[PDB]
Amino acid sequence: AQYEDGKQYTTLEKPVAGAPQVLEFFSFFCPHCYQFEEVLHISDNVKKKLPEGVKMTKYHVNFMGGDLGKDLTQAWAVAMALGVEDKVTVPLFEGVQKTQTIRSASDIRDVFINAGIKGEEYDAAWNSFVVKSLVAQQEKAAADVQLRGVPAMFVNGKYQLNPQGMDTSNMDVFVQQYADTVKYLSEK
Numbered sequence: 162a163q164y165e166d167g168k169q170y171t172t173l174e175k176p177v178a179g180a181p182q183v184l185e186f187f188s189f190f191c192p193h194c195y196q197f198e199e200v201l202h203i204s205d206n207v208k209k210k211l212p213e214g215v216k217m218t219k220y221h222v223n224f225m226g227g228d229l230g231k232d233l234t235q236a237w238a239v240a241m242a243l244g245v246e247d248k249v250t251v252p253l254f255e256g257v258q259k260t261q262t263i264r265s266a267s268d269i270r271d272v273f274i275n276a277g278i279k280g281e282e283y284d285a286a287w288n289s290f291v292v293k294s295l296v297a298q299q300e301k302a303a304a305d306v307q308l309r310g311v312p313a314m315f316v317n318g319k320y321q322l323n324p325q326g327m328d329t330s331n332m333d334v335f336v337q338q339y340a341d342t343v344k345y346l347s348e349k
């Protein structure tokens with residue numbers, strides 16, 4: 162077959178009931194995740210190949226970066242609760258990996274302040290029980306699939322994308338193969 166288990170995707174041995182339709186895991190410490198955001202725009206390109214209104218979910222993970230990795234999962238919960246993901250994704254990636262100016266929870270907060278989120282608004286979300294629950298949701302979703310690596314995509318709780326089985330001589334072709342595989346899996 163053109164799409165084969167083990168080539169473009171793998172199949173979870175223990176599928177996850179009630180998982181999001183399209184679920185991405187990433188870390189701001191993750192070098193491939195940086196590339197998936199700024200160089201390849203994987204999420205944008207996957208979204209353009211799926212029907213309108215399809216739910217794409219993106220969660221941060223704890224297992225990269227120690228204390229700061231957990232702070233970043235909480236900050237992503239804040240970004241999700243406030244709806245400011247598109248405002249902070251690039252400054253957070255570049256603060257961690259390009260300029261290396263993010264070293265503390267206060268440095269993360271500065272990114273949100275510079276992006277126009279009010280200090281009281283950020284701090285109130287950071288300490289909120291809604292954010293505590295969003296943190297739990299992200300942890301539970303990664304636990305459900307026993308996640309050991311990022312960037313990762315899962316489709317319908319059953320299929321995991323396999324980007325290493327994909328051609329990387331051309332960045333544009335790679336993105337297209339990845340996006341077309343998600344479409345195929347979403348229709349499976």
Ligand SMILES: O=C(O)Cc1c(-c2ccccc2)oc2cc(Br)ccc12
Pocket residue numbers: 193196197200201311312324325329332
């Ligand atoms: O090097 C590869 O075979 C595929 C790949 C990955 C990747 C590999 C493993 C897990 C997640 C992603 O990221 C890339 C980014 C850019 Br630009 C170009 C290629 C890749």
